[PDB]
Amino acid sequence: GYRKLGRTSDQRKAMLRDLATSLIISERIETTEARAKEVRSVVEKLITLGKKGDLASRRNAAKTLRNVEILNEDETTQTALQKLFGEIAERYTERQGGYTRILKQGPRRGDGAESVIIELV
Amino acid sequence: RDILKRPVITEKSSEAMAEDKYTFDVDTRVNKTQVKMAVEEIFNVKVASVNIMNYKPKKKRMGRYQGYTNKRRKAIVTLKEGSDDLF
Amino acid sequence: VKRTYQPNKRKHSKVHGFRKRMSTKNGRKVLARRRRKGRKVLSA
Amino acid sequence: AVPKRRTSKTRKNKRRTHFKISVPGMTECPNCGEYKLSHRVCKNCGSYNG
Amino acid sequence: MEAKAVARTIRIAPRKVRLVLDLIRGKNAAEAIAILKLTNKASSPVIEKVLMSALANAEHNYDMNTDELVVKEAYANEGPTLKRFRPRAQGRASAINKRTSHITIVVSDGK
RNA sequence: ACCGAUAGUGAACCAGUACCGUGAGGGAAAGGUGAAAAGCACCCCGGAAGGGGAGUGAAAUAGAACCUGAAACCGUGUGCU
RNA sequence: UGAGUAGCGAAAGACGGGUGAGAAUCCCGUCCACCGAUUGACUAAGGUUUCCAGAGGAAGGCUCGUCCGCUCUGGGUUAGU
């Protein structure tokens, strides 16, 4: 691996799946410096599967994404697998990498760690 | 006689008035049969049944000195006719 | 780990109560010494 | 291993020569007008220009 | 002349307070405010309020301009200690000291 | 030709009280504004505690943690090194 | 003085929205996680108001706290079987 983030092997990969899913549902989250440095690889590799749009690519993405429901506006409820292959994948058909960005904020109270903003470009 | 001491007006007793149930504070050493015969001679009301319960002193401290409150005996009386007309 | 003290209301009154101290000649002397001392609690 | 002798206040002050903190390293933000951390956003308006 | 502000019996140890105080001595009024707002210490919010309250006195009780002000004095004293206890092993206990400090800030126009 | 708050009764304060023990039993620490409460109206910084003015008072570093206020110990600035 | 040193008492959390002067630690929602001959449901002894609602943040909580078995104000235990 790259870095362990003070977690066991089984529970580290479960946290990365939750972080990747949340960055698709809301497209903008705030978290720790170290965690966001490695969510880039997970999220950006997942959009690559979405652009291909194959059945083998869709089943290879269903083993990383969680099961949630999208409901923000008045339209029909949608999943997270459907959103990635239907909305995100159509905004990067002409882009080669660099689907995410990181912006630093500063140290937070009570912990001393710095928070950052990661979002889809 | 003067078995009854004070009436009780609380949030739970207000909804108990709709069922013709009145809450009074009684003497510590009396039974509900005595309380039954005390309402009928003061308000001239026919009663149906009487409930009663006992409490315990509460440790309340104000300032620097600790102490206890008085033990309380509370009775609930059910009326079939009339009304006590508490002001 | 079982400890030495296991409280019980009945035992505390039948061994150290007022009527137990009044039932023997040497128990009345205990109450007299505490009365002379001025204790707020004469017996358990 | 207990200390053998009492530590004088001359040794204690010498030891704390390097026990200190420094300034965060702030720079002026040419949108807000007040200082901000380098490579970070301006807390008053959230402008990480450039 | 000099204006001052004092805060008494703050639940912070005096040794930890003096770390931030040495970063503002002789600084500009705006520089001192900026330094205290960008450090992630425990005493930074507390000291800043004492400085901002000392500047308000210099602008109201006296006819000064708050653009040439400098920090002339900044020190922390100690106050009464709160003595607690903590149970250790083998049935004994150890003492715990909760210390307090008095924070003072002085701003001077100059002259 | 006895003590003057570590003294004098254990107890000058609501002390055989707190508290400790199953029980018999053991057993503390704590006095002081000012002559008079006249106990800071009002203005400024906060969420508050606190502080700076004004005012009462002979005195407010006598502001209720309040008569004087030593030492240990902890901080700031300076002449010589 | 030791010294800003040892320790902070078995363990899986992540993000969105609010409250707020101040939020990793408080509320609401989603996902993931742990026990399930028991960390689930009753009741005897023992404790004696720790139970409920509305307010508060000095001290207690081995951190923070807008929260609490903590403070203030009011309430709560109903038998011929």
TrEMBL record, chain A:
GO BP, sorted A to Z: translation
TM regions (residue ranges): none
Keywords: Ribonucleoprotein, Ribosomal protein
GO cellular component: cytosolic large ribosomal subunit
Keyword Ribosomal protein: yes
Keyword Lipoprotein: no
Subunit composition and interactions: Part of the 50S ribosomal subunit. Contacts protein L32.
Family per record: Belongs to the bacterial ribosomal protein bL17 family.
Name this protein carries in UniProt: Large ribosomal subunit protein bL17
Organism: Staphylococcus schweitzeri
The organism's taxonomic lineage, starting at the top: Bacteria, Bacillati, Bacillota, Bacilli, Bacillales
TrEMBL record, chain B:
Recorded superkingdom: Bacteria
SUPFAM superfamilies membership: Ribosomal proteins S24e, L23 and L15e
Keywords: Ribonucleoprotein, Ribosomal protein, RNA-binding, rRNA-binding
One GO BP: translation
Molecular function, one GO term: structural constituent of ribosome
Entry keyword annotation includes Ribonucleoprotein: yes
Purpose of the protein: One of the early assembly proteins it binds 23S rRNA. One of the proteins that surrounds the polypeptide exit tunnel on the outside of the ribosome. Forms the main docking site for trigger factor binding to the ribosome.
Family: Belongs to the universal ribosomal protein uL23 family.
Protein name, as recorded: Large ribosomal subunit protein uL23
Encoding gene per record: rplW
UniProtKB/TrEMBL annotation, chain D:
InterPro entries linked: Ribosomal_bL32 (IPR002677), Ribosomal_bL32_bact (IPR044957), Ribosomal_zn-bd (IPR011332)
Domain of life, per lineage: Bacteria
GO MF annotations in UniProt: structural constituent of ribosome
Keywords on record: Ribonucleoprotein, Ribosomal protein
GO cellular component entries: large ribosomal subunit
Pfam families in the cross-refs: Ribosomal_L32p (PF01783)
GO biological process, one term: translation
Protein family: Belongs to the bacterial ribosomal protein bL32 family.
Protein name: Large ribosomal subunit protein bL32
Provenance organism: Staphylococcus schweitzeri
Automatic annotation (TrEMBL), chain E:
Stored InterPro entries: Ribosomal_uL22, Ribosomal_uL22_bac/chlpt-type, Ribosomal_uL22_bac/org-type, Ribosomal_uL22_CS, Ribosomal_uL22_sf
A molecular function (GO) term: structural constituent of ribosome
Gene Ontology cellular component list: cytosolic large ribosomal subunit
SUPFAM superfamilies: Ribosomal protein L22
PROSITE patterns documented for this protein: RIBOSOMAL_L22
GO biological process: translation
Keyword RNA-binding on entry: yes
CDD domains on file: Ribosomal_L22
Domain of life: Bacteria
Swiss-Prot/TrEMBL keywords: Ribonucleoprotein, Ribosomal protein, RNA-binding, rRNA-binding
UniProt KW Repressor keyword: no
Functional summary from the UniProt entry: This protein binds specifically to 23S rRNA; its binding is stimulated by other ribosomal proteins, e.g., L4, L17, and L20. It is important during the early stages of 50S assembly. It makes multiple contacts with different domains of the 23S rRNA in the assembled 50S subunit and ribosome.
UniProt subunit comment: Part of the 50S ribosomal subunit.
Family note: Belongs to the universal ribosomal protein uL22 family.
Protein's name according to its UniProt entry: Large ribosomal subunit protein uL22
Organism: Staphylococcus aureus
